[PDB]
Design a protein around this ligand. Structure first.
Ligand SMILES: [Ca+2]
Ligand SMILES: [Ca+2]
Ligand SMILES: [Ca+2]
Ligand SMILES: [Ca+2]
Lengths: 212, 212
């Protein structure tokens, strides 16, 4: 674009650098870090108010019990299992707590997932039928096959998969992205190839099949 | 060894070549193929008699229902889930049936697993306590960590893990070895490194964590 009245922000704007440079290196290094630059200051402040309502001991961090007990936007609730998946995605320094910055990324992740649920729940409001899982995951960036989409519905759902079970699926897919990073950072496998979503999709198909 | 009275068979003896060359390429190419050369002709014949007792429709192949319904040595029974894991390991041409040769490898796999169960069930006969899983898996070639061993017990077991649940664990570990082969055969990852058990052990630890 060259129009002065419609200029778009650039990735890596100098105006954000100082903040980014002060962030913990574990957070900056994660695959999901770009979520944080999708959040405007007004939403940062709403998210903080949400955080304060889930932060039962005013520690300024969330522990898995607070995730298990918390309510999230859109009525989302996290089972003990899904809460652990969220910890394994977002607790980037493996110390058993999620910081505010890690929670912001989790919140935005859930918002994206929520949006895709509502956009893809076409057959029956409030649920995803098995055939609706595939397009919703693809739109999120998870390029799986049909067999995988039906398996995910079966494992995480009932004939219908509600919002909470969808969040659980998305958490599994994201936790598998973190796993891929952990596996392939091992220098045994040589220099890490750039991320290819189609190739990661095959990895996700293989890993999902191990859940039965 | 140079003693004439104690000569050992060599891997790849010319005497076996003709048989090997007539085997389906999918069977020859599997990671578990070396199991087949551990079986003497007398045992081949016992295994065939076992096979005939599980082969309900005399097809000369076993389908998942026959695995679900069959009894195996040592009293082993396969749940529907474990039977599917056995199919995913041993049905090397993905046609929904296990041949006699694929069953022979499965049988020997179960025998190895059985032996290690009895050798490692020291605290209480008939069960493995969580601390006993680690040494038994290591002896089989699965170099996992403590956290993983406790997770496997929890997922597949109760305070005690019986023989059937141990077979299920071993099946999961073996199915993950097959997954690793599938993933890393993808030429995106470049030429496949030689198999390293310690490195695969890390892969198994990461993948196990995705089961919660
Ligand atoms: Ca707290
Ligand atoms: Ca943390
Ligand atoms: Ca049959
Ligand atoms: Ca087959």
């Amino acid at each position: 674009n060259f129009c002065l009245w419609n200029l778009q922000p650039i990735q890596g704007s100098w105006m954000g650098a100082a903040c980014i440079y002060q962030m913990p290196p574990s957070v900056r290094n994660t695959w999901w870090f770009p979520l944080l630059n999708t959040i405007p200051l007004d939403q940062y402040t709403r998210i903080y108010q949400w955080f304060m309502g889930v932060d039962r001991d005013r520690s300024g961090t969330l522990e898995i019990n607070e995730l298990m007990m918390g309510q999230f936007p859109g009525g989302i609730r996290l089972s003990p299992q899904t809460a652990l998946r969220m910890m394994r995605i977002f607790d980037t320094d493996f110390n058993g707590h999620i910081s505010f910055y890690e929670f912001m990324a989790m919140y935005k992740f859930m918002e994206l997932a929520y949006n895709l649920f509502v956009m893809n729940a076409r057959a029956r409001s409030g649920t995803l039928e098995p055939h609706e899982i595939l397009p919703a995951l693809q739109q999120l960036g998870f390029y799986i096959n049909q067999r995988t989409s039906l398996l995910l519905h079966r494992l995480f759902a009932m004939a219908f998969c509600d919002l909470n079970c969808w969040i659980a699926i998305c958490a599994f897919a994201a936790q598998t992205r973190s796993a891929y990073q952990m596996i392939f950072m091992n220098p045994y496998y040589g220099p890490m190839k750039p991320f290819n979503p189609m190739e990661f999709g095959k990895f996700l198909d293989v890993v999902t099949s191990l859940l039965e």
